[PDB]
Write a protein that binds this ligand. Structure first.
Ligand SMILES: *[C@@H]1O[C@H](CO[C@@H]2O[C@@H](C)[C@@H](O)[C@@H](O)[C@@H]2O)[C@@H](O[C@@H]2O[C@H](CO)[C@@H](O[C@@H]3O[C@H](CO)[C@@H](O)[C@H](O)[C@@H]3O)[C@H](O)[C@H]2NC(C)=O)[C@H](O)[C@H]1NC(C)=O
Ligand SMILES: *[C@@H]1O[C@H](CO[C@@H]2O[C@@H](C)[C@@H](O)[C@@H](O)[C@@H]2O)[C@@H](O[C@@H]2O[C@H](CO)[C@@H](O[C@@H]3O[C@H](CO)[C@@H](O)[C@H](O)[C@@H]3O)[C@H](O)[C@H]2NC(C)=O)[C@H](O)[C@H]1NC(C)=O
Ligand code: HEM
Ligand code: HEM
Ligand code: HEM
Ligand code: HEM
Ligand SMILES: [Ca+2]
Ligand SMILES: [Ca+2]
Ligand SMILES: [Ca+2]
Ligand SMILES: [Ca+2]
Lengths: 215, 146, 141, 141, 146, 215
């Protein structure tokens, strides 16, 4: 069991993932890195339930050895070496691609596959969806008050008030899951709406859709 | 698009040593001042009024970092580049209205930037590999232009 | 149109490549032949091997003409008139090949003088090399 | 440089396209927009659908500027000086797009006047169209 | 290199109607007159001193026929163009010493020749299809340059 | 069993193949056209043993319908419609690709895997080899007197006097089977010599090799 730590974060439940092996600390590449590896690291450290798995050196770049790459954790592995990956040291990555993690510490918001980030409270912020163990934003193409309504009622935040575009509460960072969201307005969840296939889009993160509810 | 074992090793080898934060920031800045007609695409970046102001512009450095970073997804899948930039290909056409011929300019500038920072590790055979890489990535971004 | 600042940046970078005429010329050609193999089309009778006496000989002639052009930048068309008929009317080198050679020449100076090839000077050499290219393929169309 | 024969060929072929300014202009644009999809980049705000009044209106302007250049063939840079700034300094059309439109215009006159577009006249229009292209890309190179 | 059912129908439909002897000579002739510098590759064909002589030259008529005939080997086998011109790719490199950039020129002359001969069958969609075929054939002849 | 005729040739037994179907004489596309189809047309006409199967309108282009294409004769069929092929009239060819055949006129054994054509007689001319049921020429790269010796001895023409290059006796027409042929001289046939794989070459027919023997 390798040993892990979080570095260059605001605290010690968020930061750049670093593992220990052969007396040397090294970073972890973000190929195949997602919430399955994230919940393993948060559990080791005693930091909780793995809010997100930021790619591309969110908390700065490490220096020196890059131990692991192409991690394929099932999510329940005791430590990070108990996962299937490329052999120690063998990688074609670069330190810009050092994977990070954000843990809860004690307070417990996952539920469920939908969340609003970057707002004053739960019921305001851009929209993020949970798909294939990665959080991702929603492009504002075709994004109207009906689409934000489905988000508001799924979160129990009452009715929709606005549906801001152009990343009103700030841009996303890694994955853009949905584009061309075509809701009738009375769907249960956002994944029940008519939209493009998961992952397909013609967008960048300057176009992440938001949602404002009451309140 | 067929890669040789030595061409992959030349691209993998460089990619592990590139100071992407700086090379990407300098390549994008060199685009904006070698070919200054590209500044109209980046009007939201603010102060583009001199070569010194463009190097120091934090949003030019931020976006340039994310551009050279995106060649990383081509580096880590060399034999799958077309699908890796399917997303960005639609973006630059029917969201940004970028003439695909401009892709050549940024890519050829990246070669001059990489040459500057690797001096004599950037052998002609290493340049040939990364010229092919730049050139394939540019063809991938132009693959879906309606 | 080679503003007064472009002229100083160009002559300022040719002062550190003045002595290395054969060296930088041999490398710029070997890079053109390596990264752009089709350019070998116009030298079928040459030894294109690494370090060949012909590449080092013709390579010196290539940047020596660029050096002669940097001295007389008020009039580049007149200082390279001899080579205009050689490349445009006797060999007919297709113009997209000059963009390639200028690209390789920029790579060489970036390798040996990265301090000098600041992006201001970068934009000036690209202005300069694109004018030398035009002179060598302007009598057509 | 459009010798006396080149001038007669170019002025003669615009006799047969004189009345067909809108018809051939809209077709040249639809041709370019279809065979070279990236050329739609510079017209994002336009209606590029088949037979749009915006393609007909802009296409009529394009070849009307060519007709106005065929008359003053001895001075083409001056007769299109007002458009040189629009294309090279305001919009910055990449020069490789001018050969694409010239290719499509040649297709239009070849379809509608195949007996008039002899290989002599082909060569004269290609030199003429390269002249119009270099006038509109004159603020660079 | 992906073809659609409509692009194949345009290329196939036109091919069964082309007068190859007469468009091939027409296209090759126009290459030698529109771009006079190409006559150097054909100095063994005899009289090329004037546009009339280039038209009537029997070796120009003959070789232009064979060039357009070789596009037929691409038409009749579209999903295999790279391998069809593998042999001709080597020939044009290390026997003829033809700059690949010229492959673009001859194909665009061919599209004008085809457009002149086919009147109102050479739709904008048909030109799009044949420009793609010319563009693929040209890339295929440039594939094996050492 | 439909009638066949040979049009625009020197005589009855050579020319462009034309088949009769729906009372309309139509040509045959040359894709998949080889000596197997050739000797079916030569038996059917009583013309002998099918010296060659000229592709691409050697005897001119037909007009009207193209009935057969992609013929796949075993070589023993009684007629040309009893061969596996695409349906009548269904093809994408044009007339530049019309197949032709050249018969001998009298019953003789097969010419052999090797022949000298275009010269004064049997023992001097352009080298052509028979492989995959198609006659094809030989490129003149590495072609020397040792390679002509194998051709002369196999044909029973004595020793090789010359190995002319640059298409001395005229250019070949369809296939180029061999390039970079490197014999030692003592080989039994030209397929026993060192060469590029069949059909691989960097040549054109202006470069066809030849051989001259005692004659
Ligand atoms: C947002 O999504 C709606 C709903 O889409 C409809 O329902 C889904 C469950 C699927 O079955 C879809 O295929 C289906 O279209 C889209 O609204 C629908 O748009 C169509 C086309 O504009 C409307 O068709 C009209 O219908 C009547 C006859 O009923 C005719 O008068 C018209 O000629 C026309 O065809 C359809 O009625 C409409 N449905 C609803 C419930 O509004 C909507 O287009 C989509 N948004 C976008 C931008 O695509
Ligand atoms: C044409 O082919 C000949 C003969 O090639 C030989 O026999 C064939 C049947 C094949 O089995 C070939 O693989 C085999 O080599 C080539 O001549 C041969 O060339 C090689 C390398 O140039 C010679 O090797 C030399 O051998 C001696 C030891 O005997 C050493 O002193 C040398 O260092 C060197 O390695 C080989 O002896 C030679 N063989 C003969 C019989 O001459 C020939 O090169 C080839 N032509 C071309 C243009 O490729
Ligand atoms: C190899 C060439 C190129 C690559 C790999 C590339 C890649 C990218 C990527 C990954 C993004 C999204 C960045 C993000 O998510 O924040 C982007 C956006 C963008 N690209 Fe490119 N691009 C290329 C060429 C160009 C060129 C030549 C131009 C203009 C001349 C251009 C203009 C833009 C602009 C304006 C944006 C939006 C920036 C913003 O508003 O934040 N790109 N590109
Ligand atoms: C861009 C600036 C260039 C300059 C200043 C330049 C200069 C020269 C010089 C000095 C010579 C030799 C003159 C002599 O020997 O008397 C030459 C010849 C030649 N150049 Fe260049 N050249 C340039 C670009 C190119 C390019 C890009 C190509 C091909 C891709 C090219 C192809 C040739 C050939 C084939 C010859 C003749 C070779 C020979 O003399 O045997 N030139 N040029
Ligand atoms: C080759 C000969 C060409 C001629 C004679 C020509 C002429 C013109 C004319 C007369 C106008 C309208 C001027 C005005 O409204 O004030 C115009 C506008 C324009 N042209 Fe061209 N043009 C040419 C080539 C091109 C090409 C190749 C492109 C793009 C690939 C292009 C892109 C544009 C655009 C974007 C506009 C402005 C659209 C608008 O006004 O809404 N032009 N040109
Ligand atoms: C799509 C473009 C082209 C195609 C498909 C093509 C195809 C061919 C073919 C099939 C041959 C062999 C003909 C034979 O067996 O007799 C040939 C020969 C030849 N090619 Fe091309 N070619 C192309 C472009 C060019 C260009 C642009 C040039 C020169 C500017 C060129 C120069 C030659 C020459 C000189 C020959 C020798 C002809 C002879 O000596 O009879 N080719 N080409
Ligand atoms: Ca994983
Ligand atoms: Ca969309
Ligand atoms: Ca057969
Ligand atoms: Ca050979």
């Amino acid at each position: 069991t390798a040993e892990v730590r979080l570095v260059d974060g605001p605290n010690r439940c968020s930061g750049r993932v670093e593992v220990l092996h052969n007396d040397v600390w090294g970073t972890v590449c973000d190929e195949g890195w997602d919430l399955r590896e994230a919940r393993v690291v948060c559990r080791q450290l005693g930091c909780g339930t793995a809010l997100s798995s930021p790619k591309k050196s969110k908390y700065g770049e490490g220096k020196g050895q890059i131990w692991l790459s192409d991690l394929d954790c099932k999510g329940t592995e005791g430590s990070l070496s108990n996962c299937k990956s490329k052999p120690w040291g063998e990688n074609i990555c670069n330190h810009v691609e050092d994977a990070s993690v954000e843990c809860s510490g004690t307070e417990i918001p996952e539920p469920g596959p939908l969340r609003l980030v970057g707002g004053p409270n739960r019921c305001a912020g851009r929209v993020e969806v949970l798909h294939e163990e990665q959080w991702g934003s929603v492009c504002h193409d075709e994004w109207d008050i009906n689409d934000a309504q489905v988000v508001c009622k799924q979160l129990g935040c009452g009715d929709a008030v606005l549906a801001p575009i152009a990343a009103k509460f700030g841009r996303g960072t890694d994955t853009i899951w949905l584009d061309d969201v075509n809701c009738t307005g009375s769907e249960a969840s956002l994944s029940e709406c008519q939209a493009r296939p998961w992952g397909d889009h013609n967008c960048y993160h300057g176009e992440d859709a938001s949602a404002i509810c009451s309140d | 698009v067929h890669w040789t074992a030595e061409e992959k090793q030349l691209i993998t080898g460089l990619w592990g040593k590139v100071n992407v934060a700086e090379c990407g920031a300098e390549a994008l800045a060199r685009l904006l001042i070698v070919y200054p007609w590209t500044q109209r695409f980046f009007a939201s970046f603010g102060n583009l009024s001199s070569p010194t102001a463009i190097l120091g512009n934090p949003m030019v450095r931020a976006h340039g970092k994310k551009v050279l970073t995106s060649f990383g997804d081509a580096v880590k899948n060399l034999d799958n580049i077309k699908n890796t930039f399917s997303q960005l290909s639609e973006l630059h056409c029917d969201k940004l209205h970028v003439d695909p011929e401009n892709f050549r300019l940024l890519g050829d500038i990246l070669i001059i930037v990489l040459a500057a920072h690797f001096s004599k590790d950037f052998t002609p055979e290493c340049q040939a590999a990364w010229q092919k890489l730049v050139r394939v990535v540019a063809h991938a971004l132009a693959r879906k232009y309606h | 149109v080679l503003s007064a600042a472009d002229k100083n940046n160009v002559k300022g970078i040719f002062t550190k490549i003045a002595g290395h005429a054969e060296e930088y010329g041999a490398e710029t050609l070997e890079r053109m032949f390596t990264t752009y193999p089709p350019t070998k089309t116009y030298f079928p009778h040459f030894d294109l091997s690494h370090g060949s006496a012909q590449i080092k000989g013709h390579g010196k002639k290539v940047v020596a003409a660029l050096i002669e052009a940097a001295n007389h930048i008020d009039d580049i068309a007149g200082t390279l008139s001899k080579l205009s008929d050689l490349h445009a009317h006797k060999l007919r080198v297709d113009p997209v090949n000059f963009k390639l050679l200028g690209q390789c020449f920029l790579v060489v100076v970036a390798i040996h003088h990265p301090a000098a090839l600041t992006p201001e000077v970068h934009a000036s050499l690209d202005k300069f090399l694109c004018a030398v290219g035009t002179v060598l393929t302007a009598k057509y169309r």
